[PDB]
Amino acid sequence: MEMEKEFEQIDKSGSWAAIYQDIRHEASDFPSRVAKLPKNKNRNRYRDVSPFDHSRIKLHQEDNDYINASLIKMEEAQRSYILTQGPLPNTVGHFWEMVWEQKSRGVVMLNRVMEKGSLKCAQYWPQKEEKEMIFEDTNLKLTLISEDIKSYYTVRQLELENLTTQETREILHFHYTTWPDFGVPESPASFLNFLFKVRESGSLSPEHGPVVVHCSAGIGRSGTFCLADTCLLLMDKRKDPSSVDIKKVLLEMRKFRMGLIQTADQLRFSYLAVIEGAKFIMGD
Numbered sequence: 001m002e003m004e005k006e007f008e009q010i011d012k013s014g015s016w017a018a019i020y021q022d023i024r025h026e027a028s029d030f031p032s033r034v035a036k037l038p039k040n041k042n043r044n045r046y047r048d049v050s051p052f053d054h055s056r057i058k059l060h061q062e063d064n065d066y067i068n069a070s071l072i073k074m075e076e077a078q079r080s081y082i083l084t085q086g087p088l089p090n091t092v093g094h095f096w097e098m099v100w101e102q103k104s105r106g107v108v109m110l111n112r113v114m115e116k117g118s119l120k121c122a123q124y125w126p127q128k129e130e131k132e133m134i135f136e137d138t139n140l141k142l143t144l145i146s147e148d149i150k151s152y153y154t155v156r157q158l159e160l161e162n163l164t165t166q167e168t169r170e171i172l173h174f175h176y177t178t179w180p181d182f183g184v185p186e187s188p189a190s191f192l193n194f195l196f197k198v199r200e201s202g203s204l205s206p207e208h209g210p211v212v213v214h215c216s217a218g219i220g221r222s223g224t225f226c227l228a229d230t231c232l233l234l235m236d237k238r239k240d241p242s243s244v245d246i247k248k249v250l251l252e253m254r255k256f257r258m259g260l261i262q263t264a265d266q267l268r269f270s271y272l273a274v275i276e277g278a279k280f281i282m283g284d
């Protein structure tokens with residue numbers, strides 16, 4: 001069923017809450033035993049948001065390999081994403097260790113450091129060229145190379161150095177700065193312009209490791225970004241773009257991380273983004 005007609009049918013019937021609860025009921029439940037070990041309590045931002053054991057990213061260290069991060073591997077679309085929480089004061093070194101070890105080119109940030117008057121994630125990148133950051137626990141150095149501030153997003157060029165080998169890599173930081181403190185954007189225009197700036201950079205392409213995507217918990221805004229990207233890629237690949245079922249794609253993604261799309265309004269926004277986005281994939 002053409003999703004644009006499914007959309008109008010749910011809107012006219014006002015059934016978004018019902019559709020969303022059906023997804024919650026059918027979603028996968030896999031063990032997260034490593035996330036719940038006592039040694040890992042200060043590595044989790046939220047007690048109710050944990051990576052599954054089967055899909056969690058492992059740090060390359062014998063001490064403690066745990067980070068709150070999941071590999072979302074989309075087999076038909078040929079895309080992979082790492083979805084993670086906003087870094088905590090004691091996990092900023094782990095965060096950059098993961099980017100290094102997984103060979104990521106891009107980090108996608110969908111929150112502000114402060115929202116609703118509370119801290120939603122650590123200040124984990126440098127704000128001035130001449131004030132670099134050193135992560136002594138993981139032996140990494142991080143330098144701000146350039147910053148491009150736009151109305152709806154900021155792009156930063158960062159240099160990450162493995163101090164153990166003196167290898168360096170260029171990381172791109174894509175920071176969506178205008179998601180509202182409450183609810184979802186009235187239009188999906190800026191978020192879609194943003195997704196396509198990430199695509200144009202190479203950060204989502206198979207010559208690199210998976211993109212790292214986060215918000216505060218790494219499930220709500222983060223889930224909207226990967227869901228919209230994968231649905232648009234499937235529409236460009238299939239003979240019948242109308243066969244793409246956003247609810248079925250979301251349930252596939254929920255096999256790899258719990259809770260993706262946190263509200264009925266985020267579900268409606270994801271439909272709007274794919275619909276309004278589709279009016280280009282198809283040749284405009």
Ligand SMILES: CCOC(=O)[C@@H]1CN(C(C)=O)[C@H]2c3cccc(C)c3O[C@@H]12
Nearest residue numbers: 188189190192193196276277278280281
């Ligand atoms: C309400 C939605 O309309 C939009 O804002 C555009 C829709 N779209 C796609 C991929 O469908 C994005 C896009 C593609 C190329 C260039 C731009 C500046 C751009 O912005 C988004």
